[PDB]
Amino acid sequence: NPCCSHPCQNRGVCMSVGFDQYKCDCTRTGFYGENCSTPEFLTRIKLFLKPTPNTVHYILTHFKGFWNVVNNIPFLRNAIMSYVLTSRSHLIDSPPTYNADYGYKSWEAFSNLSYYTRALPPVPDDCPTPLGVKGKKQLPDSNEIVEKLLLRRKFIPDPQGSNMMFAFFAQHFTHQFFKTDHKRGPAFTNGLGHGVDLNHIYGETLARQRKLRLFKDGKMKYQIIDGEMYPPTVKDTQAEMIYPPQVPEHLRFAVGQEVFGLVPGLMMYATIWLREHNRVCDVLKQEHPEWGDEQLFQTSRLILIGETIKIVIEDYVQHLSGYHFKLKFDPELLFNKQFQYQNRIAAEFNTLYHWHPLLPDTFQIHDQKYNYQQFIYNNSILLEHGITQFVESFTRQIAGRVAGGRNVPPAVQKVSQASIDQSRQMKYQSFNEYRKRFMLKPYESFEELTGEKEMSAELEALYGDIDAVELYPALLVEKPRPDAIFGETMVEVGAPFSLKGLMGNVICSPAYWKPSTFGGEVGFQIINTASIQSLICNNVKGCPFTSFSVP
Amino acid sequence: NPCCSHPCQNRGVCMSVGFDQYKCDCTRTGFYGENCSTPEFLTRIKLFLKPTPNTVHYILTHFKGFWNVVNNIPFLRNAIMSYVLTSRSHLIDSPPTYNADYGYKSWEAFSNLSYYTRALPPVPDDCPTPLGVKGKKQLPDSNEIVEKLLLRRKFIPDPQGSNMMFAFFAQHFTHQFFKTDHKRGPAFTNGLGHGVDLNHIYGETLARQRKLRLFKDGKMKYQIIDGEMYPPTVKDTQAEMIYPPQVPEHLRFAVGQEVFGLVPGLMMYATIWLREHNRVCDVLKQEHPEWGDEQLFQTSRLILIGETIKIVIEDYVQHLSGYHFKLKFDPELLFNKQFQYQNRIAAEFNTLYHWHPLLPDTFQIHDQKYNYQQFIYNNSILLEHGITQFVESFTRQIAGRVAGGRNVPPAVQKVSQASIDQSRQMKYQSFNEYRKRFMLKPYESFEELTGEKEMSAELEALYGDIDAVELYPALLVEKPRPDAIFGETMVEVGAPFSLKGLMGNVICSPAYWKPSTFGGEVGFQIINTASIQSLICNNVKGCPFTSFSVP
Ligand code: COH
Ligand code: COH
Ligand SMILES: *[C@@H]1O[C@H](CO)[C@@H](O[C@@H]2O[C@H](CO)[C@@H](O[C@H]3O[C@H](CO)[C@@H](O)[C@H](O)[C@@H]3O)[C@H](O)[C@H]2NC(C)=O)[C@H](O)[C@H]1NC(C)=O
Ligand SMILES: *[C@@H]1O[C@H](CO)[C@@H](O[C@@H]2O[C@H](CO)[C@@H](O[C@H]3O[C@H](CO)[C@@H](O)[C@H](O)[C@@H]3O)[C@H](O)[C@H]2NC(C)=O)[C@H](O)[C@H]1NC(C)=O
Ligand SMILES: *[C@@H]1O[C@H](CO)[C@@H](O[C@@H]2O[C@H](CO)[C@@H](O)[C@H](O)[C@H]2NC(C)=O)[C@H](O)[C@H]1NC(C)=O
Ligand SMILES: *[C@@H]1O[C@H](CO)[C@@H](O[C@@H]2O[C@H](CO)[C@@H](O)[C@H](O)[C@H]2NC(C)=O)[C@H](O)[C@H]1NC(C)=O
Ligand SMILES: Cc1c(Cl)cccc1Nc1ccccc1C(=O)O
Ligand SMILES: Cc1c(Cl)cccc1Nc1ccccc1C(=O)O
Ligand SMILES: *[C@@H]1O[C@H](CO)[C@@H](O)[C@H](O)[C@H]1NC(C)=O
C-alpha cells in the first residue's frame, strides 16, 4: 500500500491508484504538487507571518500588566477570544471523517455514532511496520515503556499549582464523553451525545433518567444524611452501578455515570452537581409557579449545561492554560463567524486526556491519609467527612505534573499500559504525524523531544527512530513548557478538541442562546455568573473557599 | 395558558410567567415590544425593500431569454444560486428545536433522534381550542373535509405537465426520510439519518445492509430475470419486506426500504438505483483494481448520494419550481457562507409532502390500464412489461394537480383523512400561523385563500374562522400559482426543508467535497454530470427518453 508512508503533506488526502502508485488530493490545503508540499503564495505569506505556538504561549503567559488592560477593554478581549475559538476550531473536521475502521471517507464512518471519530486515519492493515514504514517491525513492549519512561519513582508536583479539585473535576467532567465501550472495543463509545450533555448526571438513556428522577418539582432523587443532600441508592432507583461486592447496599450511590462510584472524588462532584440541579429547580419554581415537573427538570438541565461550559472555559481551561488573558464563555462571539454547532468525540482526545500523573501517592482528607487500596470504592469516607471537608482538603492538596515523564503512580500503572496497547489496537499513527496534523514542526531527535539525555536514550533504545515514537508515551515524556503542567503537543492537539466540544454545543447556537430557553433572565443569569467558587458556595455547607490551584 | 393565543410575533418565543401573564423573547428577531411587533430601524429598511414571493416567482418564471443568458454566465448563476440557498435556509432552525412533545426548548427534544422535529411548537394542551384560541371547541369532521374539499370528482391534470416519472420519483426519494413509525405514533420516524443517506437502497441498519450486499466487488445482491438485473428476493437475502400473503416467494423483491413492494412504480426506481450502484462499482474497480469490496461499496454509496442530490436539485426541483433560472448543485457556493451541515426532518415537511392528488385514476403501462386493486403489490406487472416500458409509459402519462382542491383519488381517500387526523394528534398550529412562520401574509378570508367561491364557502361552513383552517387541507385547496402545480404556501414552506436536507448533507461539507472522497476525478465526475436522463440512459435497456414532464 503506497499510502503507508503518509506521503501527502498539509492535510492532503492520499489515495491509492493501482497497486504501485498513489495520488494526493491537495484540494483547499493551500498547497500543491505531488505531495502537497509546495505552498501557494498566500500560504507563504501566512507561514512567514505566523508566530510559533511557543512564542504565542510566552506572550500569553507574560506581561501581566498589559493583559490587565486588554482584559478590561471588552472590544479587544472579545476579538481575541473570538479569534482563539475560530482559529483552533479550524483544526477539527466537522462533520467528522475517519474512525478506527475507515482510513477513507465513508457513510459508515460518518453515520455510526458508536465509534469514536479520528483526527488522523488508521494506519492501513498491510503496512511494512505497524506505524507505516518507520520504526522496527514490532513496537516496543508496552510494559517496558511504562516502567522505563512513565512509572513514578519520586512524586513530581505540578508547578502550575493544580490541586485535587482540579484533578477530580477533570476526571468527572470528561467522563461524560469519554465512555469507552469495552464490550465492543476501544474504538467504541457509550456517549452517543458526543459532548457536554451532562449524561454523567442525568443518565445516557431516558430509561435511566427516569430511574434517577423524583418526578416532583423537576428534581432528582436524593437522600438526607447528617442533614445534607446526597445521591440516592441503587436499591431505591434500580439504576445499575459498578460496585465491588464488598460495598454494602446502602452505600451504593446511584448517579448518571455508572463508574462514578470508583472514587469518592467523583462521587463528591456528582453530589455537588446533584444539589445544583435541585437548587436550580427551587429557583425556577419561584419564577414559574405554573410549570410542571417536566419543564422544571428539562429547563434545569439546560441551565446546568450552560453552567458547565461556563466553568470549564473561565475557570478550568483558564487555570489550565496559564494565560493572563481572561478567557470568556460567550456564544455571541461566534454568531458572525462560520462555525458548526455539532461535535464528534475523537479517540485521540480520549488518549491525550489520560492524565493519571495528576494523581497523588495518597489522598489527604482533613487530617487523615488514604492509600489507593482504602480510598477506591469507599463512599463511607465521603459520609465520614462530608462535602465541605472534601473541598477544603482537595483545594489544598497539590496534583502531579502530567508532562515531563516518570510520574504515573504505580497504582494505575496497568492503566497506562492499556492506554498504549489500545492505541496500537486502534492503529494510531506516530507522534510526529500528529504534530504535523496540528501544524507543529516534527521533532528531529529524541533529545529534542524530552529536552534531556536520560529518557531520550531509553526512547532511542526502544524506538530507534524518532518518527516511530507513539502518541501517548511521547505526550507524557515531552519537555514541559517553562514551569508548566504540559508540553507543547498536549496543548496544541488538545485545545481544538476541547473548544469544539464546548462551543459546538447546541445551547451555544443562536436559536438556543436566549433568556426564554432557560426560563427567563433569572435562569439565563445562573449560567453567565457561574464559577467553580459559586458552584461550591451555593451547594456546599459553609461556603468554603475553593479554586483549581493551591493557595 | 396565555401563550395559547400565540401572542409573540416574528419568531419571538412565548413563555408563561405565573398563571395569568406571558413574556416574549425578542432576541435577534429584528423586532421589539410586548409582542415583538415593532420593527427595528434596519428591519424597516429590509421589509421595505423585500419583494413578495409572488413577485419573485413571477420574475423567475418569466423573461426566458434573460435567464438563458444568466444561466451561461457562471458568475451570475452562482451568485444567484448561492442567495437562494442561504436565504431559504435561514428559515430553518439548525440544530433543531421543538417536537410533538415539547413546545419549549429541551435536551430531550434536541437529542432524541426518534422524533420528527417541529418548525412550530405544538399547541399547548389545556387551550381554549385545539389550535389555540381561534376556531370552535371541536375541529370539523375530517372525513367531511375530505369529501367536500379534497375528494376528486373529475381528474384534474397538472398544468406544469408533471408525469408519473415525477410522481414516483417524489415518492421513492422522499420515503428515505419520511419513515413514520406507526407502532410508536405519527410523531416518530425510523429514518435516524434524517436526510439523504439512501437507506431506502442500502437499509437503515448495518444488519439489513449486510443482507442486501453481495460482498463481492462492492456490489449489491441481485437477480437476472429475462436477461435484466432486478433486486434479490426476500428468500435469498433474509431481508424483511412488507408483502401481503398472496404475493408468491419469487416476486417478493427485497430492497432497502421495507415498504417499496407497495407499488411497481417504487420498485422501478429501486431497480434503477440498484443497477446504478453496481454500475458505479464496475467503474471504480477499473479505476482501482487494488480496492477491496468494502471500499468499493462505500465509495459507490457516496457517489450515489452525490447523484441523488444532483438530480433532485437540477431536474426534480428544477421542473417542480417552473423556474427559467437553472438551479445548480454546487457545495462550493456555501464555503464562504454561514451554514450548518446537519439536518433534522420536520413533521410539517412530512405533512405537506402528501401529494396524493398526483396519482391518476388508472395506471397505463404500454397498451394496458390498471386500477389500484390490480396495480398495488403487483410486481408481476414490473416483470411483464420490464423497466424500459415502465419508463416509456410513465414519461407519457400525466400526473394530477396538487393545489386547487378536489383531486385526491377515492383510492387513497383514507390516506388524506389520516394526514388531517395525525396532524391533530400532533397538535399542529393553524395554517395562518405557519404562513407567518415562513414570512407570508396570513389570509384574511376563505376566498383570498382559494381564489374561488365554492370551496371557500365550504371551508367557512366547516371552520367558520379563516384563522381556524388547518395546515394540510389549506395546502391542497390553496389557489395555485398561474398554471402551476402548487400554491404559494406549499413552495415557501417546502423549499427550506428541502434545501436544508440536500445541502446539509455531510458530502457537501468542505472536508468531504473532494475528488479523493469519491475515488478520484472519474467518480467525482459521475456526480457532477448526473441527470434523471443519464440515470435512465445508463441502466435502462434501449436508453429511452425520459423527463419529469410529459412530451
Ligand atoms: C483526565 C483526568 C483523569 C483522572 C484524574 C483519572 C483518575 C483516575 C483514578 C483516581 C483515583 C483512578 C482510580 C483511575 C482509574 C482508571 N482510569 Co482514569 N482518570 C482520568 C482520565 C481517564 C480517562 C479519559 C480514561 C478512559 C476513558 C474511557 O474510554 O472510558 C480513564 C480510564 C481509567 C481506567 C480504565 C482504563 C482502561 O480500562 O483502559 C481506570 C481503571 N481515565 N483513574
Ligand atoms: C410525495 C408523493 C407521494 C406519492 C406519489 C404517494 C403515492 C402513494 C400511492 C401510489 C399508488 C399509494 C397507494 C400511497 C399510499 C399511502 N401513502 Co403515499 N405517496 C406520497 C407521499 C406520502 C408521504 C410523504 C406519506 C407519509 C410518510 C410517512 O410518515 O411514512 C405517505 C403515506 C402513505 C400511506 C400511509 C398512511 C398511514 O399509514 O396513515 C399510504 C397507505 N405518502 N401513496
Ligand atoms: C425518545 O423518546 C421516546 C418517547 O419518549 C422514548 O421511548 C420511550 O422509552 C421509554 C423508556 O425506554 C418507554 O417506557 C415504557 O416502557 C417501560 C419498559 O419497562 C415501562 O416502564 C413503561 O411501560 C414505560 O411506559 C416508552 O414506552 C417509550 N415511548 C415510546 C412512545 O416509544 C425513547 O426511549 C427516547 N429515545 C432515547 C434514545 O432516549
Ligand atoms: C456501528 O458499527 C458497529 C461495528 O461494526 C456495529 O456493530 C456490529 O453490528 C453487527 C450487525 O448487527 C453485528 O453483527 C454480528 O452479530 C449478529 C447477531 O446475530 C450475528 O449474525 C453475527 O455474529 C454478526 O457478526 C456485529 O457483531 C457488531 N459489531 C460490534 C463490534 O459491535 C453497529 O451495528 C453499527 N451501528 C449501526 C447503527 O449500524
Ligand atoms: C473506608 O473509609 C472508612 C473511613 O471513614 C474506614 O473506616 C474506618 O476504619 C477504622 C479502622 O478500621 C475505624 O477505626 C474507623 O472508625 C472507621 N471509620 C468509620 C467512619 O467507620 C474504612 O476502613 C475504609 N474502608 C476500607 C476498605 O479501607
Ligand atoms: C397483477 O398483474 C398481473 C399482470 O402482470 C395480472 O395477471 C393477469 O391477469 C389477467 C386477468 O386476470 C390475465 O388475463 C393475464 O393473463 C394475467 N397476466 C399475467 C402475466 O399473470 C394479475 O391479475 C394482477 N393481480 C391482481 C390482483 O389484479
Ligand atoms: C482550550 C485550551 C486553550 Cl484555549 C489553551 C490551553 C489549553 C486548552 N485546553 C486543553 C488543552 C489540552 C488538553 C485539554 C484541554 C481542555 O480544555 O480540556
Ligand atoms: C427547493 C425549491 C425551490 Cl428553490 C423552488 C421551488 C420549490 C422547491 N422545493 C420544494 C418546495 C415545496 C415542496 C417540496 C420541495 C422540494 O424540493 O422537495
Ligand atoms: C513525493 O514523495 C515521494 C515519496 O513517496 C518522493 O519520492 C517524491 O520525490 C516526492 N515528490 C516531490 C515533488 O517532492
* Three-state secondary structure string covering A201-250: HHCCCHHHHHHHECCCCCCECCEEECCEEECCEHHHHCCCCCCCCCCCHH
| Rounded Cα distance, A28 and A22, in Å | 19
CA distance A514 to B24: 11
**DSSP calls for A443-466:** PSSHHHHHTSSHHHHHHHHHHSSG
Sign of CA dihedral A123, A128, A129, A133: negative
Mutation target to probe the A interface, by most A beta carbons within 10 A, among B28, B105, B296 is: B105
b (16+ CB within 10 A) / e for B464-485:
eebbbbbbbbbbbbbbbbeebb
Q: Is B19 on the interface with A (CB under 8 A)?
A: yes
Residue B394 burial class via C-beta count within 10 angstroms: exposed 0-12, middle 13-18, buried 19 and up: buried
Q: Which residue has the cell 415498504?
A: B259
Cβ B294 vs Cβ B232: under 8 Å: no
End-to-end CA distance of chain B: 56
Which three-class secondary structure state does DSSP give residue A529? coil
Tell me B228's DSSP state.
E
Give the residue among A544, A190, A246 at the shortest CA–CA distance from A394.
A544
The residues of B carrying an active-site annotation are 175, 353
CA distance B275 to B539: 6
Residue with cell 471500499: B295
Residues contacting A30, CB < 8 A, separation 6+:
A10, A39, A40, A42, A43, A46
DSSP B338: -
Residue with cell 451554514: B339
Check if A2 contacts B (Cβ < 8 Å): no
For residues B331 and B329, give the distance between their C-alpha atoms in angstroms, rounded to a whole number.
7
Q: Which residue has the cell 427595528?
A: B40
CA B155 to CA A541: how far, in whole Å? 77
Residue nearest to atom 10 of ligand 8 (CA): B495
Query: CB distance A25–B193 less than 8 Å?
Result: no
Nearest atom in ligand 6 to B381's CA: 5
Is-contact B273 B201, C-beta < 8 A? yes
Supply φ then ψ for residue B457, to 5 degrees: -65, -40
Name the B residues in 181-200 with CB < 8 Å from any A CB. 193, 197
Q: Which domains does chain B have, with CATH numbers?
A: 1-40 (2.10.25.10), 41-551 (1.10.640.10)
Q: Which DSSP state fits A14?
A: E
| Rounded (10°) angle between helices B293-311 and B521-528 | 30
Asked whether B172 and B312 are in contact (CB, 8 A), the reply is no
Angstrom distance (rounded) from CA A303 to CA A519 = 9
Is A72 near ligand 3, meaning CB less than 6 Å away?
A: no
- Cα-to-chain-centroid distance, residue B327: 17
CA distance B191 to B177: 5
Q: Can you tell me which residue has the cell 409572488? A: B54
Closest by Cβ to B302, choosing from A107, A197, A519: A107
- Our CA dihedral for A162, A168, A170, A175, rounded to 10 degrees, sits at 170
d(CA A201, CA B479): 53
Nearest to B305 by CA among B534, B528, B537, B527: B527
Q: Which candidate, B417, B418, B431, places its Cα nearest to that of B348?
A: B431
Which residue's C-alpha cell is 415539547?
Answer: B102
- Would an 8 Å CB–CB cutoff place A102 in contact with chain B? yes
Ligand 9, residues at Cβ distance < 6 Å: A 5, 7, 33-35, 37
Dihedral over Cα of B261, B264, B265, B268: its sign: positive
Best mutation site among B247, B263, B384, B390 for ligand 6, i.e. most ligand atoms within 8 A of its Cβ? B384
Mutation test residue for ligand 1: of A166, A242, A356, the one with most atoms within 8 Å of CB:
A356
Phi and psi based region of residue B521 (left: phi greater than 0; alpha: psi -120 to 50; beta: remaining)? alpha
- Per the CB < 8 A criterion, the answer to whether B100 and B350 are in contact is no
Grid cell in block for residue B194? 434524517
d(CA B283, CA B289): 10
Residues A536, A546 contacting (CB under 8 angstroms): yes
Greatest Cα pair distance, chain B, in angstroms, is 73
| Residue A95, preceding peptide bond in cis (omega within 30° of 0) | yes
Q: Is the peptide bond before A264 cis (omega within 30 degrees of 0)?
A: no
Contact criterion met (CB < 8 Å) for B290 and A13:
no
Residues A490, A403 contacting (CB under 8 angstroms)? yes
* Helix locations, B61-115, DSSP H: 64-70, 74-89, 107-111
Give A 286-315 residues with CB within 8 A of chain B. 287-291, 295, 298-299, 301-302, 305
E strand or H helix at B488? helix B488-503
Q: Which residue's CA is minimally distant from atom 5 of ligand 8?
A: B321
The residue count of chain A comes to 551
Alpha-carbon Rg for chain B, nearest whole angstrom, is: 24
Is A290 in Cβ contact with B506 (below 8 Å)? no
* Packing angle of the helix pair A488-503, A53-60 (nearest 10 deg): 70
Nearest Cα to Cα of residue B275 among B337, B306, B229: B229
CA–CA separation, A137 and A130 (whole Å): 7
Q: Residue B49 is inside which H or E element, if any?
A: helix B41-49
Three cell numbers written together for A123 = 494506519
Cell numbers standing for residue B189: 420516524
Helix (H, G, I), strand (E, B) or coil at B39: strand
Strand ranges, E, within B191-235: 223-225, 228-230
Question: Are B530 and B141 in contact, with CB atoms under 8 Å apart?
Answer: no
Residue A392 and residue B287: Cα distance in Å, rounded? 66
Distances from the Cα of A378 to the Cα of A212, A248, A386, A392, B413, angstroms: 22, 10, 13, 19, 66
Distance of CA A271 to the CA centre of its chain: 21
Cβ-count burial A121-151 (b if 16+ within 10 Å, e if not): bbbbeeeebbbbebbeeebbebeebbbbbbb
B363-365 and B368-370: which strand pairing? antiparallel
Interface probe, candidates B4, B17, B94, B107, chain A, greatest A C-beta count within 10 A: B107
Report the Cα A272 to chain-centroid distance in Å.
20
User: What experimental approach yielded this model?
Assistant: X-ray
Report the C-alpha gap between B478 and B339 in whole angstroms.
Answer: 32
Q: What number of H helices and E strands is found in chain B?
A: 24, 10
H-helix or E-strand spanning residue B389: helix B380-396
Give the three-state DSSP class for B98. strand
Angle between helices A521-528 and A293-311 (to 10 degrees): 30
Chain B CB within 8 Å of residue A512 CB: yes
Q: Using a CB–CB cutoff of 8 Å, tell me whether B86 touches chain A.
A: no
Total count of residues recorded for chain B: 551
Residue A512's identity, in one-letter code, is Y
Give burial (CB, 10 Å; 0-12/13-18/19+) of B62: exposed
* Cβ atoms of residues B203 and B256 within 8 Å: yes
Give the span between the Cα atoms of B81 and B444, in whole angstroms.
33
Alpha helix (H) residue ranges in A288-438: 293-311, 318-321, 347-352, 372-375, 380-396, 413-425, 431-437
Q: For residue B113, which ligand has an atom nearest its CA?
A: 3
Residues in chain B with CB shorter than 8 Å from the CB of A15 are: 516, 519-520
Which residue among B23, B288, B298 sits closest to A106, beta carbon to beta carbon?
B298
Distance CA A424, CA A301 (A): 38
One-letter amino acid identity for B163? Answer: N
How big is the CA angle at A35 (ends A29 and A36), to the nearest 5 degrees? 20
Say if CB A505 and CB A329 are below 8 A apart.
no
Q: Residue of the nearest CA to atom 23 in ligand 6? A: B374
Q: Is A35 on the interface with B (CB under 8 A)?
A: no
* Integer angstrom CA distances of residue A13 from B312, B375, B517: 29, 50, 9
Report the residue of A107, A297, A332, A503 to disrupt the B interface, i.e. the one with the largest count of B CBs within 10 Å.
A107
CB-based contacts of A227: which residues, under 8 Å, 6+ apart?
none
Backbone dihedral region for residue B21 (phi beyond 0: left; psi -120 to 50: alpha; all else: beta): beta
Distances (CA, A) of B255 to A213, A321, B258, B387, B540: 43, 54, 7, 16, 18
Q: Positive or negative, the Cα torsion across A60, A64, A70, A71?
A: positive
- Chain A, chain B: beta-carbon pairs less than 8 Å apart: 142
Quote the CA–CA distance of A324 and B428 in Å, as a whole number: 52
